[PDB]
Design a protein around this ligand. Structure first.
Ligand code: ADN
Ligand code: ADN
Ligand code: CL
Length: 330
């Protein structure tokens, strides 16, 4: 059907820039980290101009559904919901999506500024500093299921829990009632895993596919019980007819580890190898995961196998890290 994937997320505007470490320390930031801007960190948004920053659509899930749409081609092949501000920024972000053919229904938070992310590039590492703004006002509308009518793949990032666990919870609870419908979620960041414990727990029980990276899965493991492969197999209990129960754990250049529980409690795990990419060819790792999940969901809606799904993602991620931040044409 037209709409293959449906996702909710935080539509934010990205401000990219290569900055010196001295910058990281002045704005009390840890290289590689991802966090919400503090009051003393609100200054970065301005002071960035002295670094000829670049600007473009951001938002984890937005990027993912974006990869989907591009590969699916048809308009509204991927639908998306979220909240932008009633400012010029949100208009630009919205115009961009439409130009892509993405089906979207954005909610506007009057008097609020669209969210912005300071993507700090130092070394090859990416440092994310965000100010959600309007994003925190996201509320899933009374007719969402009608808008995303026919989609069998529903996606949501943990980043969305900051506004309210309700959104994902709601979306998650809908797909679960739909036979053949699957719910997928991303750990987004250590902090999500760390702050949305209780809610995360309830949503997990409804997740058919869980995505994340070593770092997040590690925090996940510790918080809950369980505390690579073990962490991965550990997480599968939290989710645990036979409706798909898969957990994909990415590990930078190391093999991707995927563990799934079959209808008969049989556990099958796969360690997928990542094709070598010379260090020098690597530009940055910003948007790597998003590119990965995108490839995955694409192949998924295509009926390919997990391993095969893991391969498409690897490809997408690979193309992207060989470009300055997130890029769209493959
Ligand atoms: N709190 C957040 N919620 C949603 N997306 C985020 C968050 N902070 C960073 N991002 C997005 O993560 C992307 C990188 O995966 C960037 O495009 C950035 O816009
Ligand atoms: N150092 C790296 N070398 C090769 N691929 C990488 C590296 N870091 C990240 N990736 C790719 O990005 C994905 C998400 O981190 C990985 O699954 C992998 O495909
Ligand atoms: Cl196209």
């Amino acid at each position: 059907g037209p709409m293959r994937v449906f996702a909710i997320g935080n539509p934010i505007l990205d401000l990219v820039a290569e900055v010196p470490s001295s910058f990281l320390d002045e704005f009390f930031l840890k290289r590689g980290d991802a966090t919400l801007a503090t009051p003393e960190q609100m200054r970065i948004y301005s002071t960035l101009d002295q670094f000829n920053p670049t600007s473009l659509p951001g938002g984890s899930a937005l990027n993912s559904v974006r990869v989907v749409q591009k590969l699916l081609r048809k308009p509204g092949s991927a639908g998306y919901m979220g909240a932008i501000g009633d400012d010029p920024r949100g208009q630009v972000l919205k115009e961009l999506c439409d130009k892509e053919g993405l089906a979207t229904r954005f909610m506007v938070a009057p008097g609020q500024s669209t969210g912005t992310c300071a993507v700090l590039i130092n070394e090859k590492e990416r440092t994310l500093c965000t100010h959600l703004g309007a994003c925190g006002s996201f509320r899933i509308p009374e007719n969402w299921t009608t808008f995303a009518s026919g989609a069998l793949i529903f996606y949501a990032t943990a980043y969305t829990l900051t506004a309210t666990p309700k959104n994902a919870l709601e979306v998650a609870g809908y797909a679960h009632g739909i036979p053949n419908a699957i719910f997928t979620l991303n750990l987004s960041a250590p902090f999500c895993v760390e702050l949305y414990k209780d809610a995360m727990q309830s949503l997990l029980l409804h997740t058919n596919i869980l995505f994340g990276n070593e770092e997040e899965f590690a925090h996940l493991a510790k918080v809950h019980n369980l505390v690579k492969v073990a962490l991965s197999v550990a997480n599968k209990e939290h989710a645990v007819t036979g409706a798909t129960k898969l957990v994909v754990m990415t590990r930078g250049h190391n093999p991707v580890i995927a563990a799934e529980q079959t209808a008969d409690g049989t556990v099958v795990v796969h360690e997928v190898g990542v094709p070598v990419v010379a260090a020098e060819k690597i530009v940055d790792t910003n948007g790597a995961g998003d590119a990965f999940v995108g490839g995955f969901l694409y192949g998924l809606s295509q009926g390919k196998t997990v391993k095969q799904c893991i391969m498409c993602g690897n490809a997408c991620a690979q193309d992207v890290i060989q470009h300055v931040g997130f890029s769209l044409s493959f």
